[PDB]
Write a protein that binds this ligand. Structure first.
Ligand code: K
Ligand code: K
Ligand code: K
Ligand code: MG
Ligand code: MG
Ligand code: MG
Ligand code: MG
Ligand code: MG
Ligand code: MG
Ligand code: MG
Ligand code: MG
Ligand code: MG
Ligand code: MG
Ligand code: MG
Ligand code: MG
Ligand code: MG
Lengths: 32, 200, 51, 64, 50, 176, 51, 155, 105, 117, 121, 360
RNA sequence: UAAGUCAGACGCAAAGCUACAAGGUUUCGCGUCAAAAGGAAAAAAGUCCGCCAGCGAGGCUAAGGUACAUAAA
RNA sequence: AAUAAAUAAGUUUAAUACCUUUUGCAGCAUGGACCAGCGAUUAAAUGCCGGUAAUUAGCAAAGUUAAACUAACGAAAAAUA
């Protein structure tokens, strides 16, 4: 479960929320 | 045991075991716990990722000469040097010492938490992307002396240690991110002439 | 502030600072500190003059 | 705690040690729940121990 | 003390010879000093041969 | 799921605890409140932790990870929102601060917020007034010099005459 | 050090003139107790550690 | 003057060769500030009163017996080892082709200062004869010299 | 025992009769009776101001005897370090040794 | 021990013999400097108390409570501190109310970088 | 600087030519005096040679402040530290402390100060 | 008096990070690391106290670790550790010194890792900034690593090499022979420096002192000199040939093979030289990699040596080449050990080398 | 350190002496004071929480609190 | 204990001198009315233990004083001849 939870968080670019190409899909962080 | 002299029993026992080991070899030659001991690891759990934050302050240019400022009808909240400030153009704030900037330079502040006007308000959770505040560096100064004194009555104890804190002064120039309410637009030139010296 | 000379003279070359020691030699590393009030030494004890 | 009611030193107000308030009772209940919870966790660890112990890195052990 | 006090030092030829003679004179037992010098010379000669 | 390590956090201080319990905390290398360490799940470690269940909080590797990941997701940035409040009738006048009449508010503005006192050193230069108790220290050198001159050179001297001329100027300025 | 002459001297309480008698009674007067007028504490007294 | 000139105004001692004296009774923050490091009361803190060897009255050191044996007068002799005598001969400071007397030993430097005599002692393996005259000798030295063919005479 | 404090081995009569004597040579006996490399190093360190070529020759010869005791293994670290320090004294006294002393060295 | 110059500089505003008499002024100077160390520590406690009072007064004018607001902010991930919130209630009533409405009712319109994705 | 105008008006260097206490000042002048002048065209820099006991720095500001500083037995790096704080400050007195709110504003309220909701008297 | 009964048990095992008190031990710990995994743990524990000096030294350590694994592909842990050190270099890109940059490039070049083109430009700027003021402070070892390190990375910036050459030109006469040899290697490898004044200066500086050249450096110098200066304008090639003749027997097998091929290219080979080479090459044919075997075959064939019954060198070389291609040495050792399941790493030769050997 | 100290006090928990008294006295286990500022109980040496290198109008908590005095339902 | 930290200048909050002596002192325990000047581990010889150097020391001037050193078990065999 630790391996299956680290991957999901790793597949998230939080630094891309302050790049002006963003929409309401770059903040849908939790449930893809 | 009544005596307070430290006991030498551990020394006497060690000398006996050392003598036996030196002369009499052991029968076993392996230990399973040592044989299967694995490589050293940093931890047994995945590391916790960090939360990104906007840049604190960055230089964008310099000021050429004397200028003037007028009052506007917008305000904002910015986080800087460990504390928050409510700022509007032509305000003066005092902060801790900021490294890497010089007097008569223009800096850009991006950690904006709140923007407001007379007709609308924008709330960041916790920061507003695409907003910034401009300010001019005016001073790097030593503040007034603070006298630190300690004493303990009847104990012959006394200490004196004066000190001078280091601080920085800024003047707010412009707030970007929210439009003024209708009829509140400043329709004349307001700020200085800035020589841009930061291209990325 | 690592160096105040580099702050008041933004466009000049500032040589490396001299190594400060408890004993107080002026000739450490083959360099002489011009501000010292004593003749140059070899950076060790006993004190010997370095020309 | 102090239970003594005699002497000139006034450790307690006249009448001796005062009874606990409702907040104090709630405070002592929570301190015991934490202690009981810790013992429950150690029971889980003992029932789920692996065969081989994990080796953790330490800079000071590495140097020596 | 006098040498450090004054900036310049001027000496005569006979003075130079006398100064060097006194600064090299054996402190003790002139005879013993010569013996050790001779032995070192012989060792130095043997080293050259080898 | 095997439990491979334990996380131990300190809750209580060293003050007021028996010396045979402080040794256990030192073996785990806990020194500050809220400090955490990670240890291997072994029977010897569990026995020691059973002697001080009132000084620490204990959790397994899985519990520690889940708790910290829940906090991480809560602190992630979320979209900003805006709230509008319409005021149809607005005035164009800029009202002053309610304490503008105060001399202490004005002093702060004069010192830091206004383009004041930029006309030059000569215009704004002023001489400070020495406190009465500090005057024997401010003029010590001048008094010594006058004694030095009169003792060595005498009163029929050029230096003595200069001092007297300066004293005449000071006395004349007393009449105001 | 060799050239220093060292011809210097002072007087202690046993070398200053007078001072034999006890100047005040031990008790009763309300003053401090004293044993001699040439004590180091007194003006004109001897030196505690003479040269 | 250049920087490397030496005059009376730029001399200092070697670091570590000197240390400042402690002057006590000169302030709260000074070393040995008020009471000068002597404590508060008692006999030790009131000047020269107590000898450092007094033990309080038990007097434990004088509870032991006394011995009166007289040591031998030969402890007043200068001791010379046979191994040291050979080393001088090998280096060439002594002439082994003629009789060796105490005068030769004194001049060679084997013996420093003689008031009574010289005592010869020790064991050594010799390959050449030696004839030496001393004031005293043991048996180990006599056997060593005579084994090579020498002669030891007590004068 | 009775003579020394707890844990201190009692005297050996053979060693005691060697050290208790009317004749000089105390330092030579101390280095000759050393039983380990560390012990010999301490003797030389505490007697530095009185060492002579005869003392250096014996010290280097003792390295042969200590090595023999520690057989079944190569030269240990303490022996190597002790040998290095002795070499500095050999250089210092290189011009004062006799033929016999050089042979032992 | 302070010198005469230091003592009289500190005591220039003292009353009576405390101004120019060394023995009297010295003890008054040291006691005052002790007050200052305590004074700086207490200042940080008092100012935070004043902020909370002003925030609570503003909250209750609308029918809310201070403790409810602090909890509500943490659920929305809003990290404004008490110094800023105190100033908003006094000088920016409209913005302060907007924060309360978002926390209580959550009826704010979200803003995205791309208005039309 | 205030509104883009520098506040330091002049800087005077006083030193002796043979005194040992001025050794550090002489080194600074030899090596860094010229680069310092070029960086600060708006500053009037004056050097005074005299027979005084110790070197000194004197700073004069457009607001009438005078700040003499002693640089006795200091090295060029130590001298530069004093210059940095003198040039970049407004020259306020050593006993002055800035407002405790860390902000001075002329326009404190945009929307208006809070007022009671009712007929005042 | 007694509050616990029994013998004290084992101490608990606690995961710890490096403390600020031991920040001065980081360089020592890097040296004491004996594997990539250990070095990875050392850096991780000291993450909060890493400085540019530590990042540069770690990359240099990769060369030392990889040396123990010669004859095999670079291990995965080394590659993964390198991928992380590169990110640290990017953060500290502008805070390195000239001496530290040289260490970084050599370490990554030895591992055969290509640095990003943008990073090379930033690293190059550090070296040549301020009119090469810091180049006068780089020592001989730093200069050697800078020339070979950047050359091995495929750096092809004309401006960088122009400025770097100008600063080093006045220092060539005082450099050691081994350093000068490396400079010639770079000059010959860079086409635009073929006929510059710097190239001529390097040759003139090497001629006066050739007795100090090591075997490996001597072979490279002869190769580079022949290519750059076919006609002996400077007395370098003639002097190099004389040294080869005098000490032919003392040089190692690899250098003798390389130097012999150069002579044949120079057209100074003789039957006597070919006869003398054969007995030495035949005895030590097993000490030549595939690259040196190809050189030996071409040199002997050009010289005209013919197979002899006593010393059939061609037959021996063919067998040796087959062993290297097949990698039978690992299998042969496992046969004696008795465990044939032993893992066998290998470095497959390129098809181009196979064709060249087949034609020869 | 060939230094200082050899006048100790109280809280909880035991025993002897006293009267299963004393802020009594004699031993013993732990803690605090002595040599310890800060917070809670009214003032508060020894009880509860907790150990002060310095500055700041940032944040989270312990013991204890959450209609007024007096911060928070 | 006559001040401190702040302030919209109206005021609000914090806050029982110092020394000496004590288990413990705001102490109803001791000393000082205030200012200037004076006022207390110093010198010699000897011994012990660290630090820094000289590389024996002093006289005399090819010869003398002072100190220091001076036998413990002659134990290694590393030859791909
Ligand atoms: K506690
Ligand atoms: K003492
Ligand atoms: K008075
Ligand atoms: Mg009472
Ligand atoms: Mg609680
Ligand atoms: Mg007199
Ligand atoms: Mg007493
Ligand atoms: Mg005492
Ligand atoms: Mg007693
Ligand atoms: Mg007693
Ligand atoms: Mg009692
Ligand atoms: Mg006491
Ligand atoms: Mg809270
Ligand atoms: Mg309230
Ligand atoms: Mg009493
Ligand atoms: Mg009185």
């Amino acid at each position: 479960x630790x391996x299956x939870x680290x991957x999901x968080x790793x597949x998230x670019x939080x630094x891309x929320x302050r790049x002006x190409x963003x929409x309401x899909x770059x903040x849908x962080x939790x449930x893809x | 045991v009544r005596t307070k002299l430290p006991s030498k029993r551990p020394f006497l026992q060690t000398a006996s075991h050392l003598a036996v080991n030196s002369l009499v070899p052991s029968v076993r030659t392996n230990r399973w716990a040592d044989l299967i001991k694995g490589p050293a690891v940093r931890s047994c759990i995945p590391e916790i990722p960090e939360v990104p934050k906007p840049s604190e302050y960055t230089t964008i240019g310099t000021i050429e000469g004397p200028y003037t400022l007028n009052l506007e009808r917008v305000f904002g909240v910015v986080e800087l040097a460990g504390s928050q400030y409510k700022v509007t153009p032509d305000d003066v704030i005092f902060t801790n010492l900021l490294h890497g900037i010089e007097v008569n330079e223009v800096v850009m502040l991006e950690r904006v938490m709140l923007l407001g006007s007379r007709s609308n308000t924008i709330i960041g959770r916790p920061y507003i992307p695409g907003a910034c505040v401009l300010a001019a560096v005016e001073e790097h100064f030593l503040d007034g002396t603070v006298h630190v004194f300690k004493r303990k009555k009847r104990k012959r104890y006394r200490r004196y240690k004066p000190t001078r804190p280091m601080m920085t002064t800024l003047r707010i120039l412009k707030v970007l991110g929210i439009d003024p309410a209708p009829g509140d637009e400043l329709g004349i030139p307001s700020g200085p002439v800035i020589k841009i010296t930061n291209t990325e | 502030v690592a160096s105040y000379l580099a702050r008041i003279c933004p466009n000049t070359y500032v040589p490396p600072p001299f190594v400060a020691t408890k004993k107080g030699f002026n000739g450490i590393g083959g360099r002489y500190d011009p501000s010292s009030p004593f003749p140059p030494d070899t950076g060790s004890s006993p004190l010997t003059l370095q020309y | 705690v102090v239970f003594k009611t005699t002497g000139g030193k006034a450790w307690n107000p006249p009448g001796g040690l005062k009874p606990l308030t409702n907040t104090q009772k709630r405070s002592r209940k929570e301190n015991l729940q934490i202690l009981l919870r810790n013992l429950s966790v150690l029971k889980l660890a003992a029932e789920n121990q692996p065969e081989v112990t994990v080796n953790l890195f330490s800079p000071l052990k590495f140097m020596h | 003390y006098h040498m450090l006090k004054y900036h310049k030092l001027v000496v005569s030829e006979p003075a130079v010879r006398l100064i060097e003679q006194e600064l090299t004179r054996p402190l003790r037992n002139p005879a013993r000093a010569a013996f050790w010098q001779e032995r070192e010379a012989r060792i130095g000669a043997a080293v050259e041969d080898l | 799921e095997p439990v491979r390590s334990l996380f131990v956090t300190l809750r209580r201080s060293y003050i007021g605890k028996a010396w045979f319990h402080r040794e256990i905390l030192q073996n785990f290398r806990l020194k500050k409140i809220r400090q955490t360490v990670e240890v291997a799940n072994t029977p010897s470690a569990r026995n020691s932790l059973a002697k001080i269940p009132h000084l620490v909080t204990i959790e397994t590797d899985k519990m520690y990870y889940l708790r910290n990941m829940k906090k991480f997701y809560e602190q992630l940035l979320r979209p900003p929102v805006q709230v509008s409040h319409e005021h149809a009738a607005l005035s164009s006048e800029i009202k002053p601060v309610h304490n503008l009449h105060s001399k202490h508010v004005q002093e702060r503005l004069q010192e830091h917020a206004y383009p004041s006192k930029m006309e030059g050193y000569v215009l704004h230069e002023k001489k400070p007034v020495v406190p009465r108790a500090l005057r024997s220290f401010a003029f010590k050198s001048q008094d010594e010099h006058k004694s030095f001159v009169l003792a060595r050179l005498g009163i029929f001297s050029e230096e003595a005459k200069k001092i007297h001329l300066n004293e005449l100027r000071t006395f004349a300025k007393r009449d105001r | 050090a060799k050239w220093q002459q060292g011809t210097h001297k002072t007087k202690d309480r046993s070398e200053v003139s007078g001072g034999g008698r006890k100047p005040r009674p031990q008790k009763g007067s309300g003053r401090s107790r004293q044993g001699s007028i040439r004590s180091p504490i007194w003006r004109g007294g001897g030196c505690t550690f003479p040269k | 003057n250049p920087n490397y000139f030496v005059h009376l105004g730029n001399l200092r001692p070697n670091p570590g060769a000197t240390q400042q004296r402690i002057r006590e009774g000169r302030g709260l923050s000074s070393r040995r500030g008020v009471s000068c490091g002597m404590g508060f009361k008692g006999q030790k803190a009131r000047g020269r009163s107590l000898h450092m060897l007094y033990d309080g009255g038990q007097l434990g050191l004088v509870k032991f017996p006394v011995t009166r044996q007289i040591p031998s007068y030969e402890v007043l002799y200068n001791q010379l080892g046979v191994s040291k005598l050979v080393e001088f001969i090998q280096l060439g400071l002594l002439d082994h082709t003629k009789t060796i007397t105490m005068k030769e030993l004194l001049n060679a430097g084997c013996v420093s200062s003689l008031k009574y005599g010289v005592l010869l002692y020790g064991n050594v393996s010799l390959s050449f004869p030696i004839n030496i005259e001393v004031t005293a000798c043991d048996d180990r030295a006599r056997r060593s010299i005579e084994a090579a063919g020498g002669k030891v005479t007590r004068v | 025992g009775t003579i020394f404090n707890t844990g201190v081995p009692g005297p050996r009569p053979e060693v005691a009769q060697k050290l208790s004597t009317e004749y000089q040579g105390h330092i030579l006996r101390m280095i000759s009776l050393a039983e380990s490399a560390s012990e010999l190093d301490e003797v030389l360190w505490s007697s530095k101001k009185h060492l002579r070529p005869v003392h250096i020759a014996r010290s280097c010869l003792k390295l042969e005897y200590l090595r023999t005791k520690e057989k079944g293994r190569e030269v240990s670290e303490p022996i190597k370090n002790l040998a290095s320090e002795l070499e500095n004294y050999v250089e210092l006294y290189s011009t004062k040794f006799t033929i016999g002393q050089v042979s032992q060295l | 021990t302070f010198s005469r110059e230091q003592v009289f500089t500190f005591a220039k505003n003292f009353t009576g013999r405390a101004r120019n008499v060394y023995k009297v002024a010295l003890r008054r100077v040291e006691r005052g400097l002790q007050h200052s160390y305590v004074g700086r520590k207490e200042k940080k406690r008092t100012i935070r108390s004043l902020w909370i009072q002003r925030i609570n007064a503003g909250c209750r004018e609308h029918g809310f409570a201070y403790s409810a607001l602090i909890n509500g902010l943490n659920q929305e991930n809003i990290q404004l501190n008490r110094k800023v919130l105190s100033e908003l209630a006094m000088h920016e009533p409209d913005s302060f109310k907007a924060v309360l409405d978002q926390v209580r009712f959550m009826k704010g319109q979200e803003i995205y970088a791309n208005v039309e994705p | 600087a205030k509104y883009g105008t520098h506040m330091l008006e002049s800087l005077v260097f006083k030193y002796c030519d043979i005194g040992g206490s001025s050794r550090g000042m002489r080194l600074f002048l030899k090596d860094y005096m010229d680069p310092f002048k070029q960086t600060n065209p708006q500053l009037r820099i004056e050097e005074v040679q005299n027979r005084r006991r110790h070197p000194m720095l004197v700073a004069l500001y457009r607001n009438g402040q005078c700040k003499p500083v002693c640089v006795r037995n200091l090295s060029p790096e130590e001298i530069a530290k004093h210059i940095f704080w003198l040039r970049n400050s407004h020259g306020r007195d050593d006993d002055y402390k800035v407002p405790r709110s860390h902000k001075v504003v002329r326009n404190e309220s945009i929307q208006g100060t809070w007022a009671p909701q009712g007929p005042t008297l | 008096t007694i509050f616990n009964t029994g013998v004290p048990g084992p101490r608990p095992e606690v995961a710890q990070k490096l403390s600020t008190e031991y920040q001065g031990h980081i360089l020592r710990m890097i040296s004491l690391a004996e594997s990539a995994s250990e070095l990875d743990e050392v850096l991780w524990s000291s993450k909060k106290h890493l400085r540019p000096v530590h990042i540069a030294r770690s990359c240099l350590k990769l060369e030392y670790l990889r040396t123990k694994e010669k004859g095999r592909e670079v291990s995965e842990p080394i590659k993964n550790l390198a991928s992380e050190l590169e990110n640290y270099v990017e953060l500290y890109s502008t805070k390195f010194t000239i001496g530290q940059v040289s260490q970084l490039v050599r370490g990554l070049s030895s591992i055969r890792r290509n640095i990003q083109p943008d990073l090379l430009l930033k690293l190059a700027a550090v070296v040549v900034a301020d009119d090469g003021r810091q180049v006068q402070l780089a020592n001989e070892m730093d200069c050697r690593d800078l020339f070979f390190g950047f050359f091995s990375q495929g750096f092809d910036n004309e401006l960088f090499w122009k400025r770097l050459s100008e600063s080093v030109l006045p220092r060539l006469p005082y450099f050691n022979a081994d350093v000068v040899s490396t400079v010639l290697r770079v000059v010959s490898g860079l086409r635009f420096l073929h006929n510059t004044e710097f190239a001529h200066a390097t040759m003139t500086a090497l001629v006066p002192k050739v007795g100090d050249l090591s075997p490996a450096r001597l072979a490279d110098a002869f190769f580079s000199a022949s290519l750059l200066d076919p006609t002996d304008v400077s007395g370098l090639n003639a002097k190099l040939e004389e040294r080869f003749l005098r000490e032919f027997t003392s040089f190692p097998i690899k250098d003798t093979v390389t130097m012999f091929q150069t002579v044949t290219v120079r057209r100074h080979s003789t039957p006597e030289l070919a006869a003398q080479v054969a007995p030495l090459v035949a005895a030590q044919a097993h000490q030549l990699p595939v690259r040196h075997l190809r050189r030996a075959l071409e040199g002997m064939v050009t010289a005209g040596w013919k197979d002899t019954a006593e010393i059939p060198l061609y037959a021996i070389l063919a067998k040796q080449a087959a062993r290297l291609v097949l990698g039978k040495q690992s299998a042969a050792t496992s046969a004696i050990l008795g465990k044939h399941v032993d893992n066998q790493g290998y470095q497959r030769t390129p098809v181009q080398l196979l064709r060249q050997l087949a034609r020869i």
